[PDB]
Structures are given as C-alpha cells and as structure tokens.
Amino acid sequence: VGSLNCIVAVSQNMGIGKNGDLPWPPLRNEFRYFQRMTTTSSVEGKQNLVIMGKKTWFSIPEKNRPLKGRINLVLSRELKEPPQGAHFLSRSLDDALKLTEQPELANKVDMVWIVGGSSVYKEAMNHPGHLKLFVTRIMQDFESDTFFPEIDLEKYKLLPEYPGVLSDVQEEKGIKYKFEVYEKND
Numbered sequence: 764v765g766s767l768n769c770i771v772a773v774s775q776n777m778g779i780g781k782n783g784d785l786p787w788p789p790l791r792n793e794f795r796y797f798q799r800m801t802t803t804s805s806v807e808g809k810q811n812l813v814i815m816g817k818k819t820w821f822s823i824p825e826k827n828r829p830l831k832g833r834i835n836l837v838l839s840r841e842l843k844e845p846p847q848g849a850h851f852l853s854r855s856l857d858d859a860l861k862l863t864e865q866p867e868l869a870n871k872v873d874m875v876w877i878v879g880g881s882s883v884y885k886e887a888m889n890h891p892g893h894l895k896l897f898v899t900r901i902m903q904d905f906e907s908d909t910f911f912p913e914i915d916l917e918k919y920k921l922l923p924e925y926p927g928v929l930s931d932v933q934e935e936k937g938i939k940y941k942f943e944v945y946e947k948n949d
C-alpha cells in the first residue's frame with residue numbers, strides 16, 4: 764500500500780463547508796484538481812482509496828457515488844453497514860488504515876487519500892508517520908460551519924513545489940486560490 768495523504772480546500776477563515784455544501788460557489792479547476800489527485804494511481808492494476816466522513820459522503824450527489832475510479836470508504840460509528848453505493852465502512856481512521864492490510868484491500872490499493880471532513884482530518888494529522896497535506900488556500904473569507912484544523916508548523920514542512928502541482932495563484936469566478944503541499948514524518 765502507498766502513501767498517506769489529505770486533500771482539502773480551505774477559506775482564509777479556515778472554513779471547508781456550510782449547510783452540507785462548499786462555502787464558495789463551484790470552482791471548476793479546483794474540483795478537477797481534487798479529482799485528478801485522488802484518482803491517479805502510479806501503479807498499474809491498483810486504485811487509490813478515498814476515506815471520508817459520513818456527511819462528506821452524503822454531500823456528493825447520488826449520481827456521483829461512489830467516487831468513480833477510486834475505492835470508497837466511509838467513517839461512522841452509527842451506520843451498521845456501508846451506505847448504498849459504498850462497500851467499506853470503518854469506525855475510525857485507525858481502523859480503516861488497519862483494514863488496508865487485509866487481503867481484500869492490500870493488493871488493490873495504491874495511495875490513500877483522506878477527503879474530509881473536519882474530524883477525519885483531525886485524526887489523520889495526529890496519526891504518527893509519513894503524512895502529506897494537499898491544501899488549497901482560497902484567498903477570501905466565506906461563511907462556514909465546518910473548519911479545517913490548523914496545521915502544526917513545528918511538525919510540517921511546506922514544500923515550495925510539488926511534482927504535477929502548479930504553485931502560482933489560480934483564479935476562477937473572481938476567487939483567487941493557491942495549491943500548497945505540507946509534509947511531515949514523525
């Protein structure tokens with residue numbers, strides 16, 4: 764199994780969601796970035812695994828569940844079986860990562876991507892070991908009710924460039940943003 768990664772888009776006031784949707788209007792190329800990064804596997808015959816909370820799963824329109832071309836896993840302690848469309852359901856990120864050692868996943872999974880929300884990010888960033896954060900910095904405030912935990916800059920390095928990721932300011936629909944990659948290995 765490959766590397767452990769988070770991917771998120773974050774407003775200046777650290778917001779990631781409002782009313783079960785994004786706090787900002789749709790940004791087509793931000794979405795394309797999320798889709799390409801989480802879907803692309805370096806290894807033939809393997810797919811990446813996306814791990815998400817329950818509310819994030821239900822924020823995806825039904826026509827797009829599960830996330831195409833990726834193995835989908837949902838975190839919840841209330842659900843007793845994976846929701847319709849999904850096939851994996853774990854009680855915690857710790858359990859999900861242990862699940863990727865069992866045969867049903869060990870030979871199928873390349874990279875692991877955590878795709879939200881708030882408490883999935885929080886469990887990952889306290890997880891020990893090699894971890895990358897792919898953070899889109901949306902350069903405006905947006906009203907939000909779900910937030911991204913602040914990055915401990917004593918644990919993470921900010922990479923100046925990352926392969927396949929442009930590092931200049933992006934802009935669509937009047938909104939400037941920037942792709943950042945953080946990395947730790949404790």
Ligand SMILES: NC(=O)c1ccc[n+]([C@@H]2O[C@H](COP(=O)([O-])OP(=O)(O)OC[C@H]3O[C@@H](n4cnc5c(N)ncnc54)[C@H](OP(=O)(O)O)[C@@H]3O)[C@@H](O)[C@H]2O)c1
Pocket residue numbers: 770771772773778779780781782783784785815816817818819820822838839840841842853854855856878879880881882883886909
């Ligand atoms: N901007 C972005 O990058 C981004 C990414 C994803 C989502 N969003 C948006 O953020 C909102 C959804 O995110 P959210 O934080 O509100 O909800 P969420 O994290 O997707 O789901 C919350 C539920 O999922 C379970 N859960 C979450 N973390 C868990 C963990 N570490 N271990 C075990 N279970 C866990 C729990 O389910 P149980 O109560 O059943 O145990 C929790 O109640 C939406 O508005 C979405 O549009 C934005």
Ligand SMILES: CCc1nc(N)nc(N)c1OCCCOc1ccccc1C[C@H](C)C(N)=O
Pocket residue numbers: 770771772783784785793794797819822823824827830877878879899
């Ligand atoms: C683009 C937002 C984003 N960007 C970064 N960089 N990282 C993330 N984790 C992230 O969230 C992705 C969460 C999955 O959402 C999907 C996936 C497929 C179809 C529809 C939706 C819901 C749409 C986007 C919505 N409006 O909620």
Ligand SMILES: [Cl-]
Pocket residue numbers: 912913914
């Ligand atoms: Cl931060």
